[PDB]
Design a protein around this ligand. Structure first.
Ligand SMILES: CO[C@@H]1O[C@H](COS(=O)(=O)O)[C@@H](O)[C@H](O[C@@H]2O[C@H](CO)[C@H](O)[C@H](O)[C@H]2O)[C@H]1NC(C)=O
Ligand SMILES: CO[C@@H]1O[C@H](COS(=O)(=O)O)[C@@H](O)[C@H](O[C@@H]2O[C@H](CO)[C@H](O)[C@H](O)[C@H]2O)[C@H]1NC(C)=O
Lengths: 133, 133
């Protein structure tokens, strides 16, 4: 069951998104989206996509219906059947992705932080909790 | 403990200080300090001080050698003999304290965030992890 929730006051430099979860033994890929609307085709300020099937972690944005320029993280800090903790930190420069006990990747802002209205966590993932700090 | 770490690039909005450890069986109090210098006698932008004995968590700053006005968090989110996790998040407004799963307290800036250069953790506390993202 996915987490999809509205952010009334949007997000700000200092906003922290904490995702504690579990990658299922049959999992292929799951996603963490910071969205600008409620639609399935809304703009995405951030698309965080761990892919167990291809052993990649793809960062991207989405504007006017098109995925932007793909960025990729160093290695895959995720594993089928293993728990994870992910911090997504909105700074004034971009989003910092923290997995485990280390800084994983920095994703520079392509869309203004002011446009982010919604958080989505879904895909092949089992959730313990999703927090907005 | 006493963990003393420098922050060379300083800290900007979007910085997270994660402290993991254990509160001792007969702990009285411990502290987390963000100092505006490399020495302990430096000014404190933030004094995070859980007091297990008087059952309170005191927030304050130190300027020219004297404490500012004391703030107190809602109750004590710490239990003696139990492990804890604390997030200290820097934003535009101030510092956001997160203990466990709950946003605990917002401490609005008194000293400029750009003055912070050192993290100090000490007191009755067994540290397991101190990290800055
Ligand atoms: C042109 O098709 C697109 O190719 C990308 C690169 O594929 S790869 O195998 O060389 O890595 C794919 O990433 C892309 O897949 C889509 O990627 C976006 C993020 O950029 C998002 O994760 C989508 O869920 C994913 O399908 C693929 N696009 C399509 C339409 O297939
Ligand atoms: C009147 O002296 C000051 O009283 C504060 C509240 O007293 S209490 O009875 O409600 O507990 C004390 O917190 C304060 O102690 C100092 O507080 C600062 C943070 O503001 C810091 O924790 C110091 O380590 C602590 O001594 C006390 N002030 C002084 C100067 O003793």
């Amino acid at each position: 069951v996915p987490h999809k929730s509205s952010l009334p006051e949007g997000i700000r430099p200092g906003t922290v998104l904490r995702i504690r979860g579990l990658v299922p033994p049959n999992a292929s890929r799951f996603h963490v989206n910071l969205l600008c609307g409620e639609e399935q085709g809304s703009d995405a300020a951030l698309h965080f996509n761990p892919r167990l099937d291809t052993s990649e972690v793809v960062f991207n944005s989405k504007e006017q219906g098109s995925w932007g320029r793909e960025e990729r993280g160093p290695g895959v800090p995720f594993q089928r059947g293993q728990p994870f903790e992910v911090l997504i930190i909105a700074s004034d420069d971009g989003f910092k992705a923290v997995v485990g006990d280390a800084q994983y990747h920095h994703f520079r802002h392509r869309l203004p932080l002011a446009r982010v209205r919604l958080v989505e966590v879904g895909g092949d993932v089992q959730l313990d909790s999703v927090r907005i700090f």
